[PDB]
């Protein structure tokens, strides 16, 4: 008796992540429109450009805390309570938005989910591995099934939460995301006791008595500095929301920049570290375009599409839908393609070009029909079809390339945060008048950088 040939404990983690992703993407399917609504009622005193910028840097920070939660579980609290309390914090963030408050609660909600997701996201995946003994061949299949639950929860969420918003408003819709995470907690708590190893109720590499003080020193310096920077900013008058967004952008980009300067400074090993830079650049750019689906394309869906008969947030389901459609294809493909399968950097290259083609595609309707009318939903369908096609190329191979150390490995995960941070800047350039320029410009540029990468793709391979 199994769960698709896997240990029964996988079903518990399948359900857990499905409902967490449900809560996350259900919220992000409507959060932008929600901010638009608050602005329209004079409740939220920002521009739409700023609102969209918030979406991007919010994503960026969620990914950033994700690279930290694994450490916290392994060394301090344990993987299983990390997931649980991470879940509680996520639920609370959604609770906060369900309350009769308005713009005043946006910050508290965002902070809660950033921290909570950071605790839950990397450690659920960790617990999936713990189901299999070392050298169990089912491991790949198991993680593949787990990912399917992630995509599934991301697919039904905008459909259900978006419908709820249309029916009963934002506060009810947000409460459904909260309920979703709660379901995840229910199945996780009572399901984990039955099948998860008690070993992971505690940290696996707990701090040694001599390790505690320098860690405390380390984290307290970082906080002190961060606080100091925020102090100076307010003194010199750089205390607007765009200013803080710029600060987090800087932090998000400085972290990998420092790591690269750190590695390159500290002979044969070296060339590869330099060799990874164009790949890391290609990763950031792909994620940038891909992350804009919930921001720029969300705006385009709400303003430029004949979507009078269905909740416009439903467009956010296309991303995980195409992932699920493409997945069993590429599974077969990389297997059947035995003879001369492309290298990992080529995938990176072609992947970025596809993401670039997705934006180029979106430039056509405005150039052909103008940007004052509305166009068919199919333009967006085609765009997501393309960029997900690019994801199938670069995503399954991403951590594979970069692992050919500990900070270096984290940097694949950070490419997601940096592309999103870059988005916090670029996304403010998009509007009705600049639409055709925006898409063409960043579309062509991405393709060319993919063109460059394929030229470079052999030297890097050999290394
Ligand atoms: C792997 C999939 C490849 C997909 C790439 C591109 C395919 C889809 C392109 C979208 C064509 C636009 C649809 C035009 C249409 O239906 O007519 C409506 C007209 O009013 C235009 O707004
Ligand atoms: C919120 C809905 C779930 C019901 C749980 C009620 C218990 C309330 C407080 C105590 C919870 C601490 C649990 C920590 C933990 O590691 O749980 C995970 C493990 O037991 C199962 O996977
Ligand atoms: C451990 C408990 C988890 C419970 C999750 C939270 C959900 C429970 C109740 C949801 C509240 C519904 C929203 C109330 C509301 O004001 O709706 C909108 C109203 O203003 C008019 O449309
Ligand atoms: C199995 C492959 C099927 C699709 C081929 C891949 C993409 C190549 C070309 C797609 C079309 C490019 C955009 C042009 C376009 O949609 O024009 C539409 C009309 O202008 C709308 O009335
Ligand atoms: C592999 C996909 C191939 C798809 C078909 C080729 C697409 C090439 C260019 C499409 C964009 C052309 C739009 C028309 C346009 O902008 O006209 C401009 C006029 O001068 C404006 O007054
Ligand atoms: C399906 C595969 C790839 C399809 C994408 C091919 C599209 C080719 C070029 C993108 C759009 C062309 C730019 C149009 C343009 O800049 O003209 C200016 C407008 O008239 C006004 O802004």
Q: Of 350, 361, 363, which is best to mutate to test ligand 4, by the most ligand atoms within 8 angstroms of its C-beta?
A: 361
CA–centroid distance, 371 to ligand 5, in Å, is: 15
The total number of structural domains in the chain stands at 1
**Number of helices followed by number of strands (H, E) in the chain:** 16, 0
Nearest Cα neighbor of 12 from 204, 193, 198, 201 is: 193
Which residue has its alpha carbon closest to ligand 3 atom 13?
A: 172
Q: Which domain holds residue 217?
A: 1-463
This entry's atomic model was obtained through: X-ray
**Does the C-beta of 357 come closer than 6 Å to ligand 6?**
yes
In the block, residue with structure tokens 């609102």: 51
Tokens of 17: 């992540």
Q: Dihedral (C-alpha) 132, 135, 141, 144: value to the nearest 10 degrees?
A: 70
Q: Other C-beta atoms within 10 Å of 241: how many?
A: 14
Q: Can you tell me whether residue 375 is helix, strand or coil?
A: strand
Ligand 3 is surrounded, with C-beta below 6 A, by 95, 98, 100, 168-169, 171-172, 175, 178-179, 182
**Does the C-beta of 432 come closer than 6 Å to ligand 6?**
no
Task: In whole angstroms, give the CA distance from residue 352 to residue 394.
Answer: 8
Nearest atom, ligand 5, residue 367 CA: 16
Nearest Cα neighbor of 99 from 44, 156, 15, 174 is: 174
Which residue has its alpha carbon closest to ligand 1 atom 8?
A: 382
We report the CATH number of the domain holding residue 9 as: 1.20.1250.20
Task: In whole angstroms, give the CA distance from residue 330 to residue 335.
Answer: 8
Radius of gyration of the chain (CA): 22
Which residue has its alpha carbon closest to ligand 6 atom 2?
A: 357
| Distance of alpha carbon 179 from the chain centroid | 22
Query: What would the 3-class secondary structure string for 115-169 be?
Result: HHHHHHHHHHHHHHHCCCCCCCCCHHHHHHHHHHHHHHHHHHHHHHHHHHHHHHC
DSSP 8-state assignment for residue 76: I
Task: In whole angstroms, give the CA distance from residue 169 to residue 222.
Answer: 41
CA–centroid distance, 362 to ligand 1, in Å, is: 10
Ligand nearest to the CA of 439: 6
């Amino acid at each position: 008796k199994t769960f698709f040939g896997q240990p029964l404990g996988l079903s518990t983690l399948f359900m857990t992540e499905m409902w967490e992703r449900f809560s996350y993407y259900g919220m992000r399917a409507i959060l932008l429109y929600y901010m638009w609504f608050l602005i329209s009622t004079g409740d939220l005193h920002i521009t739409r450009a700023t609102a969209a910028s918030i979406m991007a840097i919010y994503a960026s920070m969620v990914y950033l805390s994700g690279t930290i939660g694994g450490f916290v579980a392994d060394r301090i609290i344990g993987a299983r309570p990390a997931v649980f309390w991470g879940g509680v914090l996520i639920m609370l963030g959604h609770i906060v938005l369900a309350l009769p408050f308005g713009a005043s609660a946006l910050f508290g909600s965002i902070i809660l989910i950033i921290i909570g997701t950071g605790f839950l996201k990397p450690n659920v995946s960790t617990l999936v591995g713990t189901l299999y003994d070392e050298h169990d061949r089912r491991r790949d299949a198991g993680f593949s099934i787990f990912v399917f639950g992630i995509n599934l929860g991301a697919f039904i969420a905008p459909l259900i939460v978006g419908a709820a918003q249309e029916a009963a408003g934002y506060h009810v819709a947000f409460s459904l995301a909260a309920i979703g995470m709660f379901i995840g907690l229910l199945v996780y708590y009572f399901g984990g006791k039955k099948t998860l190893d008690p070993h992971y109720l505690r940290p696996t590499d707990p701090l040694a008595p001599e390790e505690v003080k320098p860690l405390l020193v380390k984290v307290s310096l970082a906080v002190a500095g961060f606080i100091a920077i925020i102090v100076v900013m307010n003194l010199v008058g750089w205390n607007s929301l765009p200013a803080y967004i710029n600060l987090l952008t800087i932090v998000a980009i400085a972290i990998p920049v420092f790591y690269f300067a750190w590695m390159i400074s500290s002979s044969t090993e070296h060339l590869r570290v330099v060799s990874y830079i164009p790949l890391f650049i290609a990763a950031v750019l792909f994620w940038a375009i891909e992350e804009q689906g919930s921001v720029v394309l969300a705006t385009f869906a709400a303003e430029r599409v004949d979507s009078s008969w269905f909740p416009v947030s439903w467009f956010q389901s296309l991303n995980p839908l195409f992932i699920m459609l493409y997945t069993p294809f590429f599974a077969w493909l990389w297997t059947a393609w035995k003879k001369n399968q492309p290298s990992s950097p080529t995938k990176f290259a072609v992947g970025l070009m596809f993401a670039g083609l997705s934006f180029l595609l979106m430039a056509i309707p405005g150039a052909l029909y103008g940007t004052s009318g509305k166009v068919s939903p199919l333009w967006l369908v085609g765009s997501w079809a393309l960029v997900i096609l690019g994801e199938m190329l670069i995503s399954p191979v991403g951590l594979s390339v970069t692992t050919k150390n500990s900070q270096m490995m984290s940097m694949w995960f950070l490419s997601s945060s940096v592309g999103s941070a870059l988005n916090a800047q670029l996304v403010t350039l998009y509007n009705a008048k600049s639409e055709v320029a925006y898409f063409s410009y960043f579309g062509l540029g991405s393709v060319v950088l993919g063109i460059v990468l394929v030229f470079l793709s052999k030297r890097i391979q050999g290394l």
